[PDB]
Structure 1
Amino acid sequence: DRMLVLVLGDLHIPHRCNSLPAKFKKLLVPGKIQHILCTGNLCTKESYDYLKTLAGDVHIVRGDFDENLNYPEQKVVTVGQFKIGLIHGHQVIPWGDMASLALLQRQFDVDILISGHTHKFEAFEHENKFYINPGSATGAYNALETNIIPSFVLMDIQASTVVTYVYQLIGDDVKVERIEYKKP
């Protein structure tokens, strides 16, 4: 029996984007995803009370532009056989730095490390660990780029292999890519 984990963040509504794309929103039927792991930058509780609608288990991490400060700056969870680490990623300098992200992986002692902020999607394995960045679901802009392709990641967890699906909205048609990771 599969576990499906939704991974998304850097929404940045209302300031940077009005709402998540309807096309994305149509795919996230409530109940069909069991877990939700969010990198942060919602930022308003509008979205936090929205994410709750879609699944019973939802975890936020604190973003540098998140207004509810009680979110944890990082969270470690387990789903099936996978120990997952979650962090927004503004703590990593330079942004998305590999060596730094690796420490947080070993420090957190996780199989999969999720981080955001760079608004750039990543899903890859490094030294037998798997690193995910869902990118920005709204396509929100970062300090350096204005045409950022919206995207969110859905993890399919089956025993010791996670299948990671990324859906990025290029043009106005959802498109996806598969990346498979097995615990070593």
Structure 2
Amino acid sequence: MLVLVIGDFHVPHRSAAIPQVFLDRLNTGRIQTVLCTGNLCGKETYDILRTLAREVHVVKGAFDEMQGLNETEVIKIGNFKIGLMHGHQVIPWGDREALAIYQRQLDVDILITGHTHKLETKEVGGKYFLNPGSATGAYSPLVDNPVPSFMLLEINDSELTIYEYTLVDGSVKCERVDFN
């Protein structure tokens, strides 16, 4: 099971484009599932996501207006129950304890959130908290210099691998995080 974790595409009145390199890479992968944190540019973004994987999941973002978008979603992949939400609702923002409360609320092994516009992989108390950052490196009050980012998860049962992709200084960088 290969899962593309992406989100935070658009900010109102600010134009952002997904880097072509990310698109070229994403277009050929055998990506089974897409978990999107929300904040889509519009229908164009959804069309793109539909091309990447058979199964696409999108939660409601701060600026999302698409009808039928749930605030939270829970998907089971391998041995992991995955919780997904935009993360603007987690107050205080990005706080470990606040996120922990939501993870417990959703009763999931993995909690995926965006909002911060900073990609982060963290394991706390045997639970995993993942943020893929902004795919387009969109403006955020929270971060001075956001960079385009996304995550690819390789899950085989209880084995979790995170591929953190970021575009820094015009050159793509990738880091691998292993969890058992």
Q: Is the 8 A contact 2:135 2:150 kept in 1?
A: yes
Q: Is the 8 A contact 2:137 2:148 kept in 1?
A: yes
Q: Distance in 2 between matches of 1:177 and 1:141?
A: 23
Q: Distance in 2 between matches of 1:88 and 1:168?
A: 19
Q: Distance in 1 between matches of 2:129 and 2:142?
A: 23
Q: Distance in 2 between matches of 1:143 and 1:136?
A: 13
Q: Distance in 1 between matches of 2:72 and 2:24?
A: 29
Matching of residues 8-157 of structure 1 within 5 Å = 8-12=6-10, 15-30=13-28, 32-157=30-155
Shift of 1:14: 7.6
Could you tell me which residue of structure 2 aligns to residue 176 of structure 1? 174
Could you tell me which residue of structure 2 aligns to residue 5 of structure 1? 3
Q: Percent identity?
A: 56
Residue identity in the other structure for 1:64 = A
Shift of 1:18: 3.6
Shift of 1:43: 3.1
Residue identity in the other structure for 1:44 = G
Deviates more, 1:140-149 or 1:157-166: 140-149
**CA 1:124–1:37 in 2, change beyond 3 Å: closer, same or farther?**
same
Residue identity in the other structure for 1:98 = R
Over aligned residues, Cα RMSD in angstroms? 1.4
Structure 2: runs of 5+ lacking an equivalent: none
Instruction: Report the TM-score, using the length of structure 2 for normalisation.
Output: 0.95
Q: Distance in 1 between matches of 2:125 and 2:168?
A: 31
Shift of 1:91: 0.2
SS of the equivalent of 2:38 reads coil
Q: Distance in 1 between matches of 2:11 and 2:43?
A: 10
